[PDB]
Design a protein around this ligand. Structure first.
Ligand code: SF4
Length: 184
C-alpha cells in the first residue's frame, strides 16, 4: 500500500501511467463526484488490477463520491458501498472480478451523454483527442498519425502509438504496468 493507495492514485506520478480511458474516467469522477455503472466498473476493476487494496478502494471511492457535499456518507453507504465491496468480494460473493481488457471495454454499450466508460480513441471527436494529446506534449505530426489509426478503426494501435510517443494482448492494465516500469 506504500506505493498504490487511495491518495497516490490521484498523484501526477501514478496517473501519468494511465491510458486515455482511465484518465477520462478519473476526470469524470473528479468533476461529477459520481460515475454511472459501466464506468464505475471499468475504473474500479482497473484499480483493483493495479494493486489498490480493498480497504484503500473503499477510502478512494467514498471520498470521491462525497466530495463537496455531493452526497452524505450515509447515502454512499446505503446506495454504493455494497457495490464497491462486491467488486472486492467483501460481502461474501466468491467471484474475483477480473479487470476488463480492451476488447471487453470496446464491446460494452457505447457511452452516451454523461458516460465516461469506453475507449476515447473511438468515442471522442478528433477535436477532443487533438486537444487532449496536445496537452500531453504531442506534436502535430504525432497527433496526425494517432488520428490516422482512429480513422481506420484501429483503436488499440492508436493507444499503442500514444504510449510510444509519451515514453523515452490489448489491456489497460498492461499499459499501466509497462509505463510504470519505465518510470522506475
Ligand atoms: S485502447 Fe484500450 S487501454 Fe487504450 S484507451 Fe482504449 S480501451 Fe483504454
Amino acid at each position: 500500500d506504500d506505493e498504490i493507495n487511495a491518495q497516490s492514485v490521484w498523484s501526477e506520478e501514478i496517473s501519468s501511467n494511465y491510458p486515455l480511458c482511465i484518465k477520462n474516467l478519473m476526470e469524470g469522477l473528479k468533476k461529477n463526484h459520481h460515475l454511472r455503472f459501466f464506468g464505475r466498473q471499468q475504473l474500479s476493476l482497473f484499480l483493483k488490477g493495479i494493486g489498490l487494496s480493498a480497504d484503500e478502494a473503499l477510502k478512494f471511492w467514498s471520498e470521491a463520491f462525497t466530495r463537496n457535499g455531493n452526497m452524505t456518507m450515509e447515502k454512499f453507504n446505503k446506495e454504493f458501498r455494497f457495490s464497491f465491496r462486491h467488486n472486492y468480494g467483501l460481502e461474501g460473493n466468491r467471484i474475483n472480478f477480473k479487470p476488463w481488457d480492451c476488447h471487453t471495454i470496446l464491446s460494452k454499450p457505447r457511452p452516451g451523454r454523461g458516460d465516461f466508460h469506453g475507449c476515447p480513441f473511438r468515442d471522442w471527436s478528433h477535436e477532443r483527442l487533438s486537444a487532449e494529446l496536445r496537452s500531453m506534449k504531442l506534436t502535430q505530426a504525432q497527433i496526425i498519425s494517432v488520428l490516422d489509426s482512429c480513422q481506420k478503426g484501429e483503436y488499440t494501435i492508436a493507444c499503442t502509438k500514444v504510449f510510444e510517443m509519451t515514453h523515452n494482448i490489448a489491456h489497460p492494465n498492461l499499459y499501466f504496468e509497462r509505463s510504470r516500469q519505465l518510470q522506475k
